[PDB]
Design a protein around this ligand. Structure first.
Ligand code: NAP
Ligand code: NAP
Ligand code: 1EQ
Ligand code: 1EQ
Lengths: 263, 279
């Protein structure tokens, strides 16, 4: 059972924190009295989030503006965020490249950019953050979608990148377990959320109930704090009932006796 | 006689029971067909009397596969050597292959970058290369092949792994790329359905296979029973011919029982009604 005091004085990074779910997470963490370093490209919007974080009661609040298309920025950002806070307890990976609901035709540039920003930068951020997270027995929080677990039309490139996060981070979770790296990994599987971006994107195309961004942001933080492997958040009782894959976990365990990693 | 001949091999029960004659005279591309499962698929297709265009980097190894395909009874057999790290090669290969056969019925996406079983530390170059070769090139080959496949009401065959459905340690990069194939190709399958593009997509979920590469990779690290490459290759072709959405092939009779996700399919079918794609 979660308590807001679990985040009191914790050193947290939040990516894609200038708006939407990312901004809501920064605000929640501020209220809990955490140290926060927020990122996104817009320096001006990050300034207002930092200012409001300090008002809400953050132990400290900083921003570092830049693009996650730049893997050098991604790497340097973590070192700089760690130096400002004097360490790192939680890494919240939330940013995505701009997308829309459209049929896929021939836009390989959007497929590549989606893999680079939505996936490869998450791997770069993890590599850069792991020494500090190993020191604190910290947490990695990976923001995904229902579209990163089941198939949906009109989001092929996006779905690929979210599926890749599951493949990558679920594999290293098993590796951390055997190599006794006490860094938890939480994959957050979210349904439709009432962010400005999502509401504009689904308008007249998707007829679904949207869940509130404030509660969504809190459920992500809760999962991270509780070191839960996965978080499932959706407005529908039918979605939450069916989204889980109990057989996958059973399968992985039956195959867990087939390895020797003493090398 | 060919000008005086006509008809269809795909009638009653052809959606369920496979016959080697379903591939007779079919125009098939096989990527990563110089060795392993890919080579076995080329050999099976040759025996079925299909037209084949095989690819890999090694011109010398592709020459031997082509020669043996012609011996086995392929209607035609050609090779185009190159690297799938080059997206210009991937695009141009499909056009050149289509010209050699006078069209395309089946696109078999099987190649992968060289990988090993290792714990992930900091090799971002291997994560990028895995995404580029195992995933992005598959998308480039699909884009280049789709006009010909639409013309023939063809098939796309995507070779994946159990590691592209469940998590395994020591294959983080590899698994990331195989999971991405599922996300990408399962989404466009739903798109093809609404936009009435009659091109089937088969995702093949394979367990450990007795290929030289896999046997060397797992040596002293992974102790699992390996399935035969010859039978594996045939099951992939069968799934493609039958237009099955997924193929599950593993040594364990139990894996086949658990690997399927009925909940995913139901969730997708319930969310299908929530759209408006009249735009
Ligand atoms: N909202 C939903 O319905 C929904 C559903 C499922 C999953 N999710 C997941 O929830 C997360 C947040 O979504 P959201 O709706 O809150 O999105 P959002 O409001 O559009 O915010 C996206 C954030 O990413 C940043 N960003 C965009 N391009 C970037 C780049 N190249 N480099 C660095 N940062 C970049 C944006 O800031 P700048 O443009 O200033 O950089 C912004 O802060 C995502 O991971 C998404 O997959 C959302
Ligand atoms: N074997 C298993 O245990 C296993 C298990 C599950 C799934 N699978 C899947 O089965 C498929 C085939 O695996 P396999 O074990 O049969 O592989 P394999 O015998 O090692 O063959 C890989 C093929 O890809 C080619 N290739 C390598 N790098 C390439 C590049 N840069 N550009 C173009 N072609 C390239 C190789 O030829 P060149 O080196 O001459 O280029 C070769 O023909 C893969 O998709 C694999 O993930 C295999
Ligand atoms: Cl057709 C369809 C596609 C995707 C979705 C869902 C979804 N996942 N990410 C998003 C975004 C991201 C912020 C961009 C915007 C809108 C919906 N999203 C799972 C809820 C619902 C329906
Ligand atoms: Cl630990 C572990 C990781 C992966 C696997 C499986 C697997 N998938 N692709 C491969 C390869 C490809 C030629 C590289 C080599 C060896 C095993 N592979 C599912 C059987 C089993 C155990």
């Amino acid at each position: 059972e979660f308590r807001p005091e679990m985040l009191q004085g914790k050193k947290v990074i939040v990516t894609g924190a200038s708006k939407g779910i990312g901004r809501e997470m920064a605000y929640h963490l501020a209220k809990m009295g955490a140290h926060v370093v927020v990122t996104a490209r817009s320096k001006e919007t990050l300034q207002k989030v930092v200012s409001h974080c300090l008002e809400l009661g953050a132990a400290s609040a900083h921003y570092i503006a830049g693009t996650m298309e730049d893997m050098t920025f991604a790497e340097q950002f973590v070192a700089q965020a760690g130096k400002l806070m004097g360490g790192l307890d939680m890494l919240i990976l939330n940013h995505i490249t701009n997308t829309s609901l459209n049929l896929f035709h021939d836009d390989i540039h959007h497929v590549r950019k989606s893999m680079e920003v939505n996936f490869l930068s998450y791997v770069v951020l993890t590599v850069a953050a792991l020494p500090m997270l190993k020191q604190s027995n910290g947490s990695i929080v990976v923001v995904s979608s229902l579209a990163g677990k089941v198939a949906y039309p009109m989001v092929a490139a996006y779905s690929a990148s979210k599926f890749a996060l599951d493949g990558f981070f679920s594999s290293i979770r098993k590796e951390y377990s055997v190599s006794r790296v006490n860094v938890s990994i939480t994959l957050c599987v979210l349904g439709l959320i009432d962010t400005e971006t999502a509401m504009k994107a689904v308008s007249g195309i998707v007829h679904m109930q949207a869940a509130p961004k404030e509660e969504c942001a809190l459920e992500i933080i809760k999962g991270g704090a509780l070191r839960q492997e996965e978080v499932y958040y959706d407005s529908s009782r039918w979605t939450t009932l069916l989204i889980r894959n109990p057989c996958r976990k059973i399968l992985e365990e039956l195959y867990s006796t087939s390895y020797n990693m003493d090398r």
